[PDB]
Amino acid sequence: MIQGVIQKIAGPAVIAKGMLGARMYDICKVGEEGLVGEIIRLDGDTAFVQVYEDTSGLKVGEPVVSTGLPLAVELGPGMLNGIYDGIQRPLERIREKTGIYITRGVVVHALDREKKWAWTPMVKPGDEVRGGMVLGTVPEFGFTHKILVPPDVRGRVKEVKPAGEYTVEEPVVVLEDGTELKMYHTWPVRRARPVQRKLDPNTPFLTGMRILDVLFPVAMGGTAAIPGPFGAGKSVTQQSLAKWSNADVVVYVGCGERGNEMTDVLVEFPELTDPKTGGPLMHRTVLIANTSNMPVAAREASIYVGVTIAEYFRDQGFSVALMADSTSRWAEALREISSRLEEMPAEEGYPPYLAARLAAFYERAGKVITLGGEEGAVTIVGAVSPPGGDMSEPVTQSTLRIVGAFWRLDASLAFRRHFPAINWNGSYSLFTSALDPWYRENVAEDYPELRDAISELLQREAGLQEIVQLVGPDALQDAERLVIEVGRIIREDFLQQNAYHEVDAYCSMKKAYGIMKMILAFYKEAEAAIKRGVSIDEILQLPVLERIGRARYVSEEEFPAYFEEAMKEIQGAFKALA
Amino acid sequence: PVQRKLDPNTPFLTGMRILDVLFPVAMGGTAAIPGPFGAGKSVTQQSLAKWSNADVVVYVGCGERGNEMTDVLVEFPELTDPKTGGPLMHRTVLIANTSNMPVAAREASIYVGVTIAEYFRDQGFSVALMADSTSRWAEALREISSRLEEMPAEEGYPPYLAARLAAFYERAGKVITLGGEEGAVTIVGAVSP
Amino acid sequence: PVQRKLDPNTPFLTGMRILDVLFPVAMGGTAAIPGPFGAGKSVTQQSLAKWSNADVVVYVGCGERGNEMTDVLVEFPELTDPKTGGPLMHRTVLIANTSNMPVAAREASIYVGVTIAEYFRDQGFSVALMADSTSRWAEALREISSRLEEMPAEEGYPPYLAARLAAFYERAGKVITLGGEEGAVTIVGAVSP
Amino acid sequence: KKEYTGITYISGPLLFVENAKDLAYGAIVDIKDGTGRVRGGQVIEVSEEYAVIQVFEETTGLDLATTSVSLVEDVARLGVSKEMLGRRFNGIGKPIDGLPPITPEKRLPITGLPLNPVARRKPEQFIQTGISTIDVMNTLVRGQKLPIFSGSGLPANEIAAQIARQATVRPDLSGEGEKEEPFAVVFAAMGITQRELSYFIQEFERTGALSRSVLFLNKADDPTIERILTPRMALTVAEYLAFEHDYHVLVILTDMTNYCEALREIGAAREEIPGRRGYPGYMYTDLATIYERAGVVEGKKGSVTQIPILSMPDDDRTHPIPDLTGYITEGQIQLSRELHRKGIYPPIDPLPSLSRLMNNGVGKGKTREDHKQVSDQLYSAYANGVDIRKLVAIIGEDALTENDRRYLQFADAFERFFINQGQQNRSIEESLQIAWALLSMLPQGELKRISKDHIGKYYGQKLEEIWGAP
Amino acid sequence: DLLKKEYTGITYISGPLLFVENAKDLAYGAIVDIKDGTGRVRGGQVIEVSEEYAVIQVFEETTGLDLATTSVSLVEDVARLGVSKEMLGRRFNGIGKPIDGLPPITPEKRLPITGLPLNPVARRKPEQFIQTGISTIDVMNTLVRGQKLPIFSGSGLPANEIAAQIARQATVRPDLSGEGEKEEPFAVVFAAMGITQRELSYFIQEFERTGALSRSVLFLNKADDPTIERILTPRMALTVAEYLAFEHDYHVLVILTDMTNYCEALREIGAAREEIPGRRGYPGYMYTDLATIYERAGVVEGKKGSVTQIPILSMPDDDRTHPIPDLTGYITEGQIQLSRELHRKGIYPPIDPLPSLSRLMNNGVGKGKTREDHKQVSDQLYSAYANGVDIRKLVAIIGEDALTENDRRYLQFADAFERFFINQGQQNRSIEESLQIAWALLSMLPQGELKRISKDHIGKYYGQKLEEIWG
Amino acid sequence: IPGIRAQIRFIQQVLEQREREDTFRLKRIKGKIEAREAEEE
Numbered sequence A: 001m002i003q004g005v006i007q008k009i010a011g012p013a014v015i016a017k018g019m020l021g022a023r024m025y026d027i028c029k030v031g032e033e034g035l036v037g038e039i040i041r042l043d044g045d046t047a048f049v050q051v052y053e054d055t056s057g058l059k060v061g062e063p064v065v066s067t068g069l070p071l072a073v074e075l076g077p078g079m080l081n082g083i084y085d086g087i088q089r090p091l092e093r094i095r096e097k098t099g100i101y102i103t104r105g106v107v108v109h110a111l112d113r114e115k116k117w118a119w120t121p122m123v124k125p126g127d128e129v130r131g132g133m134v135l136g137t138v139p140e141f142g143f144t145h146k147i148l149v150p151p152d153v154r155g156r157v158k159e160v161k162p163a164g165e166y167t168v169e170e171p172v173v174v175l176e177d178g179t180e181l182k183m184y185h186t187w188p189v190r191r192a193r194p195v196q197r198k199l200d201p202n203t204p205f206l207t208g209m210r211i212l213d214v215l216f217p218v219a220m221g222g223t224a225a226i227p228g229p230f231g232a233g234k235s236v237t238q239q240s241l242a243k244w245s246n247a248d249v250v251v252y253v254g255c256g257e258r259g260n261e262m263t264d265v266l267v268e269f270p271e272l273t274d275p276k277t278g279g280p281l282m283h284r285t286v287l288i289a290n291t292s293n294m295p296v297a298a299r300e301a302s303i304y305v306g307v308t309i310a311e312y313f314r315d316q317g318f319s320v321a322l323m324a325d326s327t328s329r330w331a332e333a334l335r336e337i338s339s340r341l342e343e344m345p346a347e348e349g350y351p352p353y354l355a356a357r358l359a360a361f362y363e364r365a366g367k368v369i370t371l372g373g374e375e376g377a378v379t380i381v382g383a384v385s386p387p388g389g390d391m392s393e394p395v396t397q398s399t400l401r402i403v404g405a406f407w408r409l410d411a412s413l414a415f416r417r418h419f420p421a422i423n424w425n426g427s428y429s430l431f432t433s434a435l436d437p438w439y440r441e442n443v444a445e446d447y448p449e450l451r452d453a454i455s456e457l458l459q460r461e462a463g464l465q466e467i468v469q470l471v472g473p474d475a476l477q478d479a480e481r482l483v484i485e486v487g488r489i490i491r492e493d494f495l496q497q498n499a500y501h502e503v504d505a506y507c508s509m510k511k512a513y514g515i516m517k518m519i520l521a522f523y524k525e526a527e528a529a530i531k532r533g534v535s536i537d538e539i540l541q542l543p544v545l546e547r548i549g550r551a552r553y554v555s556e557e558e559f560p561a562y563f564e565e566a567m568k569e570i571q572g573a574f575k576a577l578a
Numbered sequence B, C: 001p002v003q004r005k006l007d008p009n010t011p012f013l014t015g016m017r018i019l020d021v022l023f024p025v026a027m028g029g030t031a032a033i034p035g036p037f038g039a040g041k042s043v044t045q046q047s048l049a050k051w052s053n054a055d056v057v058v059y060v061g062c063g064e065r066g067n068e069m070t071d072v073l074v075e076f077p078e079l080t081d082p083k084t085g086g087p088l089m090h091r092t093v094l095i096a097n098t099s100n101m102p103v104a105a106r107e108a109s110i111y112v113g114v115t116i117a118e119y120f121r122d123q124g125f126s127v128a129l130m131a132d133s134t135s136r137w138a139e140a141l142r143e144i145s146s147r148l149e150e151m152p153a154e155e156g157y158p159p160y161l162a163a164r165l166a167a168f169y170e171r172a173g174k175v176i177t178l179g180g181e182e183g184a185v186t187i188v189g190a191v192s193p
Numbered sequence D: 001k002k003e004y005t006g007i008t009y010i011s012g013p014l015l016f017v018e019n020a021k022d023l024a025y026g027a028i029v030d031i032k033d034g035t036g037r038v039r040g041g042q043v044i045e046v047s048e049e050y051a052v053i054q055v056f057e058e059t060t061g062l063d064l065a066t067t068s069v070s071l072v073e074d075v076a077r078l079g080v081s082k083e084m085l086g087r088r089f090n091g092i093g094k095p096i097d098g099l100p101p102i103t104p105e106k107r108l109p110i111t112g113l114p115l116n117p118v119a120r121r122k123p124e125q126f127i128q129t130g131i132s133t134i135d136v137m138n139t140l141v142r143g144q145k146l147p148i149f150s151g152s153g154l155p156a157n158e159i160a161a162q163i164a165r166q167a168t169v170r171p172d173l174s175g176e177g178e179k180e181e182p183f184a185v186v187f188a189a190m191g192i193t194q195r196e197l198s199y200f201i202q203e204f205e206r207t208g209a210l211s212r213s214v215l216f217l218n219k220a221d222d223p224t225i226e227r228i229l230t231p232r233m234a235l236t237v238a239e240y241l242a243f244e245h246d247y248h249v250l251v252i253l254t255d256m257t258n259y260c261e262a263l264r265e266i267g268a269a270r271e272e273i274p275g276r277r278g279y280p281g282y283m284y285t286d287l288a289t290i291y292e293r294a295g296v297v298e299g300k301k302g303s304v305t306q307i308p309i310l311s312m313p314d315d316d317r318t319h320p321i322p323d324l325t326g327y328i329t330e331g332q333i334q335l336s337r338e339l340h341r342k343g344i345y346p347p348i349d350p351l352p353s354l355s356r357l358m359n360n361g362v363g364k365g366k367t368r369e370d371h372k373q374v375s376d377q378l379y380s381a382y383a384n385g386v387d388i389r390k391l392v393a394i395i396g397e398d399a400l401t402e403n404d405r406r407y408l409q410f411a412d413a414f415e416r417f418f419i420n421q422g423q424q425n426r427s428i429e430e431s432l433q434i435a436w437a438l439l440s441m442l443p444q445g446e447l448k449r450i451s452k453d454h455i456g457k458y459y460g461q462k463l464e465e466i467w468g469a470p
Numbered sequence E: 001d002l003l004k005k006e007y008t009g010i011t012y013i014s015g016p017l018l019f020v021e022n023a024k025d026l027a028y029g030a031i032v033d034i035k036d037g038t039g040r041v042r043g044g045q046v047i048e049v050s051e052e053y054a055v056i057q058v059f060e061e062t063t064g065l066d067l068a069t070t071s072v073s074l075v076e077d078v079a080r081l082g083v084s085k086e087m088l089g090r091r092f093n094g095i096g097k098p099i100d101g102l103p104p105i106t107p108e109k110r111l112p113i114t115g116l117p118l119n120p121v122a123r124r125k126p127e128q129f130i131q132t133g134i135s136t137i138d139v140m141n142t143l144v145r146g147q148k149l150p151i152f153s154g155s156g157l158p159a160n161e162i163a164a165q166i167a168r169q170a171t172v173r174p175d176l177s178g179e180g181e182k183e184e185p186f187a188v189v190f191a192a193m194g195i196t197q198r199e200l201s202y203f204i205q206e207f208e209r210t211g212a213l214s215r216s217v218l219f220l221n222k223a224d225d226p227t228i229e230r231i232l233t234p235r236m237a238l239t240v241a242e243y244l245a246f247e248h249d250y251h252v253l254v255i256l257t258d259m260t261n262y263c264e265a266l267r268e269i270g271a272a273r274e275e276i277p278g279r280r281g282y283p284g285y286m287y288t289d290l291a292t293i294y295e296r297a298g299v300v301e302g303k304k305g306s307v308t309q310i311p312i313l314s315m316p317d318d319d320r321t322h323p324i325p326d327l328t329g330y331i332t333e334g335q336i337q338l339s340r341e342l343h344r345k346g347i348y349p350p351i352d353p354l355p356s357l358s359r360l361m362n363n364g365v366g367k368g369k370t371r372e373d374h375k376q377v378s379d380q381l382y383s384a385y386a387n388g389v390d391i392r393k394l395v396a397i398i399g400e401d402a403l404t405e406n407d408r409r410y411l412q413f414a415d416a417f418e419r420f421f422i423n424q425g426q427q428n429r430s431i432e433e434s435l436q437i438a439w440a441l442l443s444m445l446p447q448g449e450l451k452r453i454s455k456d457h458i459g460k461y462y463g464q465k466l467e468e469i470w471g
Numbered sequence F: 001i002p003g004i005r006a007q008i009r010f011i012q013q014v015l016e017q018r019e020r021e022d023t024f025r026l027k028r029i030k031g032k033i034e035a036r037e038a039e040e041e
């Protein structure tokens, strides 16, 4: 095994000599305490190692040892309901071994090797096995977790353990070639897990938020980016997706953000309920927390660990949602690394390969035919944190060219406490046309037309807002003031949503359709009234507007009756005006 | 070299009333014209070449598009000399460059044109030099300076852009040749910000 | 050194209504008077020197016009100290490093002036220190850092510029001298953005 | 043959190899690691001390002790053939459709030569894109460089596919004309996602346009150098076909913003100080070497026409990419988000769009005699209509004159029936018919920019001819 | 451990750095003593080490050093600070040395000043409402125990006054929280970097007036002190704070006077080392350094104490996009941003509510914590004030005489809001009085315009007039 | 309109100046690293 000694220490960067034969991007144990590092440069007999921990107290001459393998994740039973670090160290076990602080040099297994799992074999001797097939199954919190042949493994089965209880270290299946397949395997974190074929998304990823699910939808194998400045509500949106999305498994990556945001999930999710299964919400969740004051080099690791875990759960035939708290912090970590390496920067100091790395990460998303022939999907929602709120930054612009949906956040709306605070003008989705068949079959036959009518109304309001800023709102003619008012009704009664409310925190597609239909019918009747000579002031005082404004708060069970009453009441109110 | 550089006391007659009256340029003078699209700059330059009192004409295209250069190279052959009725090309030297020709050539185009103009001046003639798109020449200069790893100034241009333009434009003038005859070079540049 | 720093509780009377009324400075405080050229920095500071209620004025011409130094030298010997009654020059120390005098001496001039002001404070006097331009001191530091081959912060200035300015301005204050008497140094700083 | 093993440095995208003075500048090399995997790279610096290789893809498993470098070819070349029609490649020319590789007629340097200016000729004939806003108001002329300026969320890909499916020449419209002239479309897609790749494959396969197309598709997660090479290979094929087989070649370059970002990246990887706004100081020359590879040559029946497509980074036309492109190209087709969000497709806004060479490829003997004046009149009428549309919001419809009202109606009709053609394929005659039907709404004699002969000949058409198919 | 190892072999002194040749046995980050020819001893830290030389950042000025008579000796491998309960009532300088005449403290432990990250599993949820007495904070930008809530200030704005007022008035309200009444006060750890004598005299006199010096630990780095010393001051302060909170059940309030000065020191060192910098010359790792500082707040499961941070920074040109405020806001849990426009009108505290924020406010307000109407009243206030500012922008175009009655009402609301809710001087308001003033102001708008408040609360609290409170 | 034009000019100047300063810094650092490599490799 390749061994050497430290030659230079500058912060988290160590130069080790005597490492001839070391490979690029391999893990190395640094110092007498074996700090986990990675080789990022080879130069003659020297190697450039990035320590994933603090290097204070290290000395020149201390040994550096290479494991000869790149960063890898242990994939198998025991991840759901778990919280990990950037390199997949369980944090509950670190809490037990260490106190309330994280210390360096803790070695802890990712998967629990003492818990027992009820193994039910699904292969018999003499059966051919290929990468990604199902050998058996194991229960885990209401999921039928299935053990998969490692992707690059082939052969025929010699012996299969009988049904029973075993730890993940057990050689559950042995192959004629001698290979012993356990309940878990290891996968290089920078290699995309292979799939049979990628399919065109055709089903929505329902977040429970009206503006995103209606005006800016994202498909099940799609990718969305939500940029904004601090205070605009990115974390609240990501957590709402974690709580209310229709994905089977949710992976949450806290790349270089506040630790209180991880504490919030840990405390709250166990008390919440899975939207579909009904069990605890934390049972469908995997957390990867690398907070801001935790090692910088571990941010890249956190992102790739999350994407690998998501691809595993996709290979099992699930639909997985991956939330990246800030890809900007990943980019800043790359920049710190490159500055340490004395590389030639591009744009605002970022390494040239930042865009390529973002593209590689976002192209791991998608809906696939797994190597086992099932159907799984990964949907990636990445948050961006531009400096100054400037969306012309390299990170936001590079994301803008690879993602399907773009949920731009507005500081002006966040200042007024108008949430979700999405900049409608600066947001878009590329998944609308692909999801229309689903909407017709599963929401309402004319849902696409109503959505388009809402969009045309909003564009008309945006057009007239220029004249309003020029001459003021009272100078407008009656029809234009009606357009402005109905745009305001849309903003306050349909696009506004209260994450902390008991009912409004989640909205079904049918509730959204009902509110849209109410608003459009009101607009049509008001236009007819104005053509017949009814003042706007008399229109805006109609009490049916209060019903339209309180539709958001009607529970899901009571909503249909409320909607029928309101649809009757709108016609009544504009008939009574005469 | 020349023996003496005379004064701007005699006019350069373009034949166009607006320029010849309101905004005249002298023999040995210098003028600049901006080219918007659709303004008929090409016809104006062609008429200057046709009807100017210049004996010889040097047309330098320094970094033009391919199709604009093709227009120039297909139109000038068919132009007629008002004095003789023969092809105007017989008193014209034409320097043609495109955007995708070497940057060194695009940078040296105006210099080659001015040297030819000064030669015909030293023969004792009046020469009209028309540099189309000196902005493209400045772009070539900016690229060259970047490749030499020089500190840029203003919008990435080298700190000697003004001096090079000055040296170029100051080769214009009415002179007494070393041989003791009167000759002139008049420069009309174009700028496309 | 000093025994103790006191809390400013009396005004640095200037003779200007606007500064004395709307935007006062205490007897041991600090003020900055930035302005573009032609606004009246020099006239304002000379008026501070002529009319202020300070016992001693140390006037530092750091990298500024020499005619201003000549103006002070020629004029002050004829004016009268507002309180003492004697000639105004008799209460004034002049430190002059004009614009065309050596660049590095600007820093030395600033430090020399502030030390002399501290000395006269230590005798028990209220001292006014005028810095004709701290911008030129910053320029000198930038030049020397260019020679050192240091890496600049914003606009070429060395990153320790704020530290030097802070150290200079913190020498102001009302104090109990080591001799037990009360002294004060008031600093007005001109900046030429 | 010879394998170089004197690797003495690996860092990011670069590796240094000693005792390699036999490697030409810009040669393509193969990099074999200890595990046996073979990567690719390009020589970006050669000296007596060492050669510097830029590695395609990643340098993950490479080590200084077992890696070996070998020469593939001294100059990047592409084997071209007429058999490339109907085939899909990967940006460096490797098939990605599963059919056997092509046997080449010849191998050509991808960075072709500059055309001699004196061998060029004026563009004088038009390509019918099938889209009215282009065919009538911003005509595309064989040999022209006409980009589409797009935005972040706009359907540039759909418009590109539609043009690729519908583009044709019209020999019958050219005087006596000819029976047939070959036509091909070379589609270069750079930095596209899997969704866009699937969309493009399906679009070309379903309508049968594949049989007359060549596709060079480069994914966003492919190596950057392949992105840099994709347009060069596309144009090499286009030049082959046009100027050795008399084809009329249309080139669509789908995302030049992605190309320029790749250019910036590669510049930073070679240790070059960025120029304006981070982009290389030679970006103008590179974009010129790509764009200027189109035109029409004297003595050759073929032509090359380019349609670059750009997403303006933040709707800024002053951004360096669109600024330089406008400097080099001959007009622009601008998409609008207002039209898109109002439901109109293709969302082409005539007002900020211009084709610089339109006048030389429209008129008698090519299209129709009434083309130019019809275009000018449509432009003026639509501009008046939009202005009056803003004016009505303030002063109401009653305060308008009858003519102002007619313009107000015409603008809406124009958006609904002229711009909004959906997935239709309109011949130039159909588009001119629709234009005359719309102009008939305005009173005869208010059509100042059209001669009275054309008014007499074509004025009077009814909107019902297009009313049933918006 | 008890043996002194000296390193002659200094090859370079320039600015704040010092290269020493044969020091391969000096750990990274170790603290050293630099002895000069005259016997004066000055401190420094190893920031780079190799076989060739060690780079030392000097904590004092380099005057009087020479490459012949100077020696570097090792003090300790890891920078540590002796801590004890007896730190309360003491004043230290930027490197934690007494500056008050008393003797050095006898440590109970020596803790690494860099600290370690709190495990997210170990963290609690910050939930206890702190009543600052300032209505713009209590109602709209609530402060919860365990929070990091900075003040974004200007050059001549009164941030020090606001911080001192918060320290003087801050208290928990166990009566509202349903918890057993208890009278535990706040211990204040005060860290000043680059503080002038004027500001320091203000703070010291204010604490002496309040009687808070007895339960305060002061780390004072003045503006005449070494700049590189500022690197360690926040870390020493937070080491002491964490120790007190999580080993002696104190509720600690940490005030960090000027983080702009800290960033200036960071940039100085970064430039000396010829590192490739980020924005405006600041190092690219400044986010990580500021997070190493700010993330040392919060509350821990199974322990009674807490640490609350209120950093104060001066946005240079009142610029919120400057790197220092920008990174801070991305790290901290809100911000209280002052406004020069309000300050010029005479409004104190000049807190502009729209750009301010409190991330954790929802944790510590509502039924059973403050009052059931709190969150909705805060939301309504924000909406009404935003409408008022918009109408202010509108009058410049249309003119006042053209306004509607509702627009005029929102103008009047904005004026009254600024003059009565934000302007409170040095008065301590209970959350009840603050909500009463908020409801009085909201009663100036028609009851149907209050769309963020539930009709139950509108029935219960709407109507009361402002004249009843004043005049 | 003149006020908006003045603001645009000012913002353009500030941004261009920042880019120029960053470029000068990169050139300086790379030159110094090259000199260091020449002196000591």
Ligand SMILES: Nc1ncnc2c1ncn2[C@@H]1O[C@H](COP(=O)(O)OP(=O)(O)OP(=O)(O)O)[C@@H](O)[C@H]1O
Residues within 6 Å of the ligand: B035, B036, B037, B038, B039, B040, B041, B042, B043, B044
């Ligand atoms: N003196 C003139 N008399 C009559 N018609 C003229 C005259 N000058 C120009 N024109 C006409 O006006 C047109 C000007 O617009 P056009 O787009 O055709 O010009 P261009 O020469 O191609 O453009 P550019 O300004 O870029 O050189 C000329 O093409 C010609 O048709």
